[PDB]
Design a protein around this ligand. Sequence first.
Ligand SMILES: NC(=O)c1ccc[n+]([C@@H]2O[C@H](COP(=O)([O-])OP(=O)(O)OC[C@H]3O[C@@H](n4cnc5c(N)ncnc54)[C@H](O)[C@@H]3O)[C@@H](O)[C@H]2O)c1
Ligand SMILES: NC(=O)c1ccc[n+]([C@@H]2O[C@H](COP(=O)([O-])OP(=O)(O)OC[C@H]3O[C@@H](n4cnc5c(N)ncnc54)[C@H](O)[C@@H]3O)[C@@H](O)[C@H]2O)c1
Ligand SMILES: O=c1ccn([C@@H]2O[C@H](COP(=O)(O)OP(=O)(O)O[C@H]3O[C@H](CO)[C@H](F)[C@H](O)[C@H]3O)[C@@H](O)[C@H]2O)c(=O)[nH]1
Ligand SMILES: O=c1ccn([C@@H]2O[C@H](COP(=O)(O)OP(=O)(O)O[C@H]3O[C@H](CO)[C@H](F)[C@H](O)[C@H]3O)[C@@H](O)[C@H]2O)c(=O)[nH]1
Lengths: 366, 363
Amino acid sequence: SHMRVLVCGGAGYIGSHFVRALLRDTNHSVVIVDSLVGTHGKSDHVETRENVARKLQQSDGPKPPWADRYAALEVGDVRNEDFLNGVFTRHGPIDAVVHMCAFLAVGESVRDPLKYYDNNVVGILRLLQAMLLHKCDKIIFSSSAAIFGNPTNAEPIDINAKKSPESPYGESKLIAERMIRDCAEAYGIKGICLRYFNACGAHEDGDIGEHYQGSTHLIPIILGRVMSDIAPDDKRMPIFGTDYPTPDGTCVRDYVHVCDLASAHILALDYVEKLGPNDKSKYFSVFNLGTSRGYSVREVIEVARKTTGHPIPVRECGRREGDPAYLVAASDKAREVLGWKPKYDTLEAIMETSWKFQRTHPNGYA
Amino acid sequence: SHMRVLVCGGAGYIGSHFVRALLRDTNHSVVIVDSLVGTHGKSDHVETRENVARKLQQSDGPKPPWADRYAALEVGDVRNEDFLNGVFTRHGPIDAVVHMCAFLAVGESVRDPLKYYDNNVVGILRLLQAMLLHKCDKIIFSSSAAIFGNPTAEPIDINAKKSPESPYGESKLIAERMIRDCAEAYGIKGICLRYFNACGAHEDGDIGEHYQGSTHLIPIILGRVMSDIADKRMPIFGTDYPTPDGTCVRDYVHVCDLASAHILALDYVEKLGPNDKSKYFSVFNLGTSRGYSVREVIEVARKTTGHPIPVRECGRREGDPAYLVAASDKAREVLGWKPKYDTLEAIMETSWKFQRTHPNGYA
Ligand SMILES: NC(=O)c1ccc[n+]([C@@H]2O[C@H](COP(=O)([O-])OP(=O)(O)OC[C@H]3O[C@@H](n4cnc5c(N)ncnc54)[C@H](O)[C@@H]3O)[C@@H](O)[C@H]2O)c1
Ligand SMILES: NC(=O)c1ccc[n+]([C@@H]2O[C@H](COP(=O)([O-])OP(=O)(O)OC[C@H]3O[C@@H](n4cnc5c(N)ncnc54)[C@H](O)[C@@H]3O)[C@@H](O)[C@H]2O)c1
Ligand SMILES: O=c1ccn([C@@H]2O[C@H](COP(=O)(O)OP(=O)(O)O[C@H]3O[C@H](CO)[C@H](F)[C@H](O)[C@H]3O)[C@@H](O)[C@H]2O)c(=O)[nH]1
Ligand SMILES: O=c1ccn([C@@H]2O[C@H](COP(=O)(O)OP(=O)(O)O[C@H]3O[C@H](CO)[C@H](F)[C@H](O)[C@H]3O)[C@@H](O)[C@H]2O)c(=O)[nH]1
């Protein structure tokens, strides 16, 4: 069932995986608006025409069904109203927006909040304005468990739990959920906010993922440590905080796989597509995306150890500014309403796909 | 005590009152940035160098100790990067920013949020960014009782749980987190002033909110009297709220009492420096602590005018919480705030005095 989807931030880690899924498992037409700021200014991994042609070229087994499926690449910043309006016009009419652009370094957001309030909030505000201008009524926004922060009993957080963000990154997601929500009653915009918890894993083909260099996330940062235990003879793995209210001092988290997250967006796209003016108390919804099983920083590292076969010595430090103690998803609503079935349940299987990618990319897409 | 103040939205209703107060009760220098988007694009009423000399000229009798004082006026949007930097360059260094500019129709905000999100939120961000670039480190922000929304009875505490009933309430709220965050990150000192329902005119009767195109009760009410002298029926929005009389209860605070709270807030931020901490971000609720329903206001209007103010009852205006009255202990105990006005009757008198002698606003 055809739609023309514009994907902001579509050249990033999570973005690349969603795009892949669109190309492979939908008949949807894809436009990526990305600025490349989160991709060191490069677009080699992006499945453009044009790039997919150069992949079908060098090498061949049996030509797969998805082979001619490619995305357009508009490069520039969504905060640029002039450029963005051009994108909607040239590639329209756009049916739905999947909004995945942001800055996402929780630690950085505390030290430089203006940088986060600007990009994250102003970005979304421009999207909604463009949508309005171009008669576009559907949006999937990449939200985050960072909206919940700490309780005022640590167990799976449902869609409606209290929102006390502990970081300006969390704030900026919540602000955007509010703007989107408010556009529902006012303009009939149909929005689904998806609260990913901790994005992890990589595509089974092992060719796109989150390289450890410049990364701020746990699993990339471990594997990165493993990549230098390997390289020709301080080294150890930093733990941020061991004095949290958890069964082992380490922050606990819910590690969901980028492909399961990808499939949630397709269900979400499908669910907003079938909404009628009849409803319309369903025009805005939210969903928490996670496995529901939690792991602590210490537990994570252990799984890396068994997955890579490497020593990985640790090294404890002080807490990072803006980290809750616990963030584990209750995903009932996603499973009921969207019929979301996450294929990856254990971290071991996810860890496998993250390793497979990293271990084959010593220098990244470079 | 000589400090240089940028007042954004200073050409407005509350701005003009705060500025006069700055000019007459302090030695602060004064610069006004305002796009004139709320003053119908004119500045005749602004106390610039030209205009303060004309008051002097038409005036008879001995000059007051403030007859020469005046503010600089800069015309443009705070959202325009170039223009703002221009203003900070020329008039710099700026010691404090007073941020009073916004869109403010609670009703319109529900119907058209992005208009409010753009202006209210993008506005405060630009300022915060421009404050950062030009090394200004003190801000006084115009907040609102609209951040509280309905409870989950009693005058409202600064730390009462905030659940906004409207996009306008939301935008004031998010600016407060933005400003709080900025204290921690960059050591900006910020005071958030939650005004309640702003009311009254100044005692001289030359300035205040004209009724034509106003979205506010008291101006709309006195509007009806003017319409009749100078349905015509005065509409009541909702009669089914859970309040004693069925109509919304609000807390009407005199613009001059609001003004003097700012001057108190300026003394409070300047009296901080390196050698401090957690006094860097603070919030104050500003009201009289007396609640008046819509019906009661109309009664006070009815008494002040001699006019019958014939009425008709409609449904709710969306985004209106039932009850919004201030608890102002903290504002008194920490700034030393003493609102000179208390009952709505005396406040209503200043309102009407202005309004009855201004058949066509400023034109
Ligand atoms: N990574 C996670 O664990 C995770 C979890 C929850 C939420 N999220 C959210 O999901 C989204 C994407 O996550 P990611 O991990 O892929 O990060 P990412 O940096 O890999 O991808 C985001 C993309 O957005 C782009 N971008 C940033 N600002 C832009 C701008 N203003 N205009 C155009 N493009 C811009 C970047 O270039 C990047 O390609 C973000 O919105 C993030 O907040 C991520
Ligand atoms: N009026 C009230 O009942 C009251 C109560 C609570 C809070 N507030 C807040 O206090 C402030 C004062 O409101 P007011 O009653 O004087 O209304 P007002 O419209 O008269 O004042 C706002 C002024 O700012 C200007 N302005 C708006 N956007 C601007 C922009 N982006 N750039 C430059 N100038 C801009 C307008 O031209 C206007 O002069 C507002 O921030 C309002 O939200 C007012
Ligand atoms: O060297 C390191 C690096 C990280 N950590 C810790 O590993 C855990 C996970 O950290 P990440 O940065 O990978 O992810 P977060 O838990 O900070 O994730 C938050 O940021 C993400 C976006 O970047 C998502 F939004 C997510 O929903 C939100 O919870 C935390 O204890 C963090 O402090 C360490 O102990 N040592
Ligand atoms: O024609 C009217 C106009 C107003 N009202 C009622 O009068 C009360 C006050 O209305 P206003 O819009 O004049 O004032 P608000 O209470 O909506 O003020 C709100 O918005 C103000 C700024 O516009 C301030 F921010 C204030 O903090 C916040 O309570 C509300 O119940 C409103 O529904 C009527 O019945 N008929």
